[PDB]
Amino acid sequence: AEEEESGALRFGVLGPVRAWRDGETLATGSPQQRALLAALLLREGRTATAGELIDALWGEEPPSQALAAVRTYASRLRKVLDPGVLVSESGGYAVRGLAEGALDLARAQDLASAAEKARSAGDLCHARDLLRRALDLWDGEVLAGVPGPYAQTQRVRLGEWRLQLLETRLDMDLDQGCHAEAVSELTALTAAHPLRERLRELLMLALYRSGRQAEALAVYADTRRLLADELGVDPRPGLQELQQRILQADPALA
DNA sequence: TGCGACGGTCTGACGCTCTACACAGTGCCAGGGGGAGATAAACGAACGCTGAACGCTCCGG
16 A cells, blocks of 8 residues: 555556556456466566467467457557557567556565565564565466466466465474464465475474474375375485484474 | 690699688659558357256254
């Protein structure tokens, strides 16, 4: 609310496709139109040619004469957004005029870099506040209802980035002395995603000092059974090592 | 025709690499046909919405 300046046009990709024009919404339109606007939004303002956008929306088999289709999608964007916010060069399309804080993705990289800098500087309160602001950026599933295998690619990429971001958040929560909300979040995420080894290692680390041992190794045994049933291999050596040092109960990491 | 000499013609002129690089003085505008590119409509299909309807276990007086 403190960064809501006059004339600000805010764009959002981490949650669904929406536009905020000084507090009032804009109709982003068709799902393919939403995917087109998102594809322009991921490229931080390239002039990207018509064939590349056609491939981004659809992939291997776009209809043959659908170049005029993308043309009229561009017309839709130009009449629903500002005339000058979208400009065309040599047949390519480009959204400019994006200030700081206009895109939630740019704010996400900014907050991640600030958290990394604070971790390098050894600060904890400012980094915790930065990642608290960062976890409020995503709203539900990223890229809600957009077609295209391209959109699937940045969907899985942003999901993986969110996974490492929450891994770092939970890790600093564990090292600074937070366990209750930590184990709550880890249990919720392992309920959501059952086949991540790193989050279950985080479960072991969090429960190891919060006063919980039986269900931690029960969850580990369930992980071993599912990983043997679905993969039939052995887990990472760092895991077995973490369970090992746990077993002799070293109070060094208290 | 035989002679020389006069002449044009033509060719290469051992070998790689450590090295190795680029290149310059004098017109002008209007009219007109294409095609990319923005606009709003439009043909077609399916995607939602209306709860309704088929049918089971159900706690039940």
